[PDB]
Nucleic acid binder design. Structure first.
Lengths: 93, 90
DNA sequence: AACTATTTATAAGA
DNA sequence: TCTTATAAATAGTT
């Protein structure tokens, strides 16, 4: 963008809202591209800072959530901590 | 990337898994960033081509899913077809 | 398992 | 909303 920003909470409410709208779309777009390219079924659930709900599902949210409940095998599970750990360990590329 | 690619299913089993691994991480990194910048809680559930599960949540998947089931109000709900439509305008 | 040039995303502007 | 300069992700090659 016009300037480099640090990843930390945006304190200006107006800025936070504009950024949320733009970046939410960008995330759904990336989910869309991954689902099509790699034949993935994806659900994304977002609650904003006011706990308003925003959702996306490649095809069918109920289908994915149900598959999730039925899953009975160990699987990759990531949190923000894990992402940050990947970034600490990973090269600059 | 070195070249623009069409958004269509990759049939190269190998290219598919390579692309899957990198873009999965890219999506989760963008989720992380949105969660911090805008003070949001985010969950991602992915079943790959083999129906294997991969999940992310900013803090706690259990919490997000519980709150989702409780949610009563109308809210935005998008699918692939909606995104494709938005992209027609560009 | 890495690098790099390019496409794509987006921060600040309009 | 958009546009547009600039940052970030990633396709292809290694």
């Amino acid at each position: 963008g016009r300037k480099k920003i640090q990843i930390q909470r945006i304190t200006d409410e107006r800025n936070r809202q504009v950024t949320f709208t733009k970046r939410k779309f960008g995330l759904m777009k990336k989910a869309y591209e991954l689902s099509v390219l790699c034949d993935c079924e994806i659900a994304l659930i977002i609650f904003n800072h006011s706990n308003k709900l925003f959702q996306y599902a490649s095809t069918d949210m109920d289908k994915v959530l149900l598959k999730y409940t039925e899953y009975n095998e160990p699987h990759e599970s990531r949190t923000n901590a894990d992402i940050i750990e990947t970034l600490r360990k990973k090269g600059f590329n």
